Amino acid sequence: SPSFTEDITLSAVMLQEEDPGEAATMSMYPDFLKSFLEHPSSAVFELIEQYEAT
Amino acid sequence: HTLLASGEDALDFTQESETSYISESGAPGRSSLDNVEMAYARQMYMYN
């Protein structure tokens, strides 16, 4: 998946730093909101699988 | 057959590293240097 290539490549582009965790933390939320956009609030389980996968 | 059927027999890949830059800091009086650096200070002072 492109997600793994992005994981390795941004690990390279991010390791220079010393606090990548929060950067990724904020990076998560736009995905949260986009997902709220594409799918309803009765689909919380698929929301949870996308949570877990990302 | 695995590659033709989207299967695999195991694979691996990652990404490399790039330059990271770090340093130290000083202190006055009760200072951040060492006795090592103080002995060095004598030497370079007399040298200069």
Swiss-Prot record, chain B:
It is found in: Nucleus membrane; Nucleus, Nuclear pore complex. Belongs to the nucleoporin interacting component (NIC) family. Plays a role in the nuclear pore complex (NPC) assembly and/or maintenance. This is Nuclear pore complex protein Nup93.
